[PDB]
């Protein structure tokens, strides 16, 4: 089997991407944030505290003839941005782009933090990291990909995120028309439950490439590119007026600037992030100070190849017995 679904930016900055997901019978379609940095499929629901729901579409398990309470199971998650959610669990039928999993754990939110409430466009998350990170207790549950894997034509999914435009998540096949050149594959460590890999270095604009190992995670659920302070300083030093602002919470730059590109290494291959991808707009409405899309990972504890980086590539998440990651230009 295969599946193919379009993923759409939630706003003009590409702060996140939503992909429609069918849950239950008859189908209830929710727009979920596909997140290769976590491993829970959770949704706003009929059980979510009413004051914490503000415009999201909810899953109502009582209206689904295939929903079954997973007795005794609960979940609770906290994300890198400080947001969180928790609740109980149903199993139900879940389909993404024509690919159907029966008996998928659907984690129903009883509580969500303010950040989720405040984002009317995201109805929940669909985790695509390794199932070892799944938070369901006392019986850990599998991700949608893990459940689908054996049925797929090939045990892979691909992320093809757009810049200020829709893109695609495919399951079970590699669309050879969706990228240019060849796909360069690179080793993955699953030890922390992430799609963790090592970039071979970087360049800033038309500068020379610096060969250096940068361990990080491919994370579709993180907006920006978080890299070591040395790398980030070298980037922003090429932008007149750029500075790290403790009050704002990262690097800012004059909105009048033209940003240089940033290149990262994948083996001997190179992915180029155009400068415009690194512009996240005014820090506040009407400001002439703009927020940078490359930020320091210092104090996160891990480097994160978030959407800023991933949207510059066609990315293969290869879930073969020994997982690997592939990157191509597009």
Swiss-Prot record:
This is Endothiapepsin. Its EC number is 3.4.23.22. The chain holds residues 90 to 419 of 419 of the full protein. Disulfide bonds join 255-290. The active site is at 35, 199. It catalyses: Hydrolysis of proteins with specificity similar to that of pepsin A, prefers hydrophobic residues at P1 and P1', but does not cleave 14-Ala-|-Leu-15 in the B chain of insulin or Z-Glu-Tyr. Clots milk. Belongs to the peptidase A1 family. One of its GO terms (molecular function) is aspartic-type endopeptidase activity. GO terms for biological process: proteolysis. Residues 17-328 form the Peptidase A1 domain. Keywords: Aspartyl protease, Disulfide bond, Hydrolase, Protease, Signal, Zymogen. The keyword Signal applies.
């Amino acid at each position: 089997s295969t599946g193919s679904a379009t993923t759409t930016p939630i706003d003009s900055l590409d702060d996140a991407y939503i992909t429609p997901v069918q849950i239950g019978t008859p189908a209830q379609t929710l727009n979920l944030d596909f997140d290769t940095g976590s491993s829970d499929l959770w949704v706003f629901s009929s059980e979510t505290t009413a004051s914490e729901v503000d415009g999201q579409t909810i899953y109502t398990p009582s209206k689904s003839t295939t929903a079954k309470l997973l007795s005794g199971a609960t979940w609770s998650i906290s994300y890198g941005d400080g947001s969180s959610s928790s609740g109980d669990v149903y199993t139900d039928t879940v389909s993404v782009g024509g690919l159907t999993v029966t008996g998928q754990a659907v984690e129903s939110a009883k509580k969500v933090s303010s950040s989720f409430t405040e984002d009317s466009t995201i109805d929940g998350l669909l985790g695509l990291a390794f199932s070892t990170l799944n938070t369901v207790s006392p019986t850990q549950q599998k991700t949608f990909f893990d459940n689908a894997k054996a049925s797929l034509d090939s045990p892979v999914f691909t992320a093809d995120l757009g810049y200020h435009a829709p893109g695609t998540y495919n399951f079970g096949f590699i669309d050879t028309t969706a990228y240019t050149g060849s796909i360069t594959y690179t080793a993955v460590s699953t030890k922390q439950g992430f799609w963790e890999w090592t970039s071979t270095g970087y360049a800033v604009g038309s500068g020379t490439f610096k060969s250096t190992s940068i361990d990080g995670i491919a994370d579709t659920g993180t907006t920006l590119l978080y890299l070591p302070a040395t790398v980030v300083s070298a980037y922003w030093a090429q932008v007149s007026g750029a500075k790290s602002s403790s009050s704002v919470g990262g690097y800012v730059f004059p909105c009048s600037a033209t940003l240089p590109s940033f290149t990262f290494g994948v083996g001997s291959a190179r992915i180029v992030i155009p400068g415009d991808y690194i512009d996240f707009g005014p820090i506040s409405t009407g400001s002439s100070s703009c927020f940078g899309g490359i930020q320091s990972s210092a104090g996160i504890g891990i480097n994160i190849f978030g959407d800023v980086a991933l949207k510059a590539a066609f990315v293969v998440f290869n879930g073969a017995t020994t997982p690997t990651l592939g990157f191509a230009s597009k």
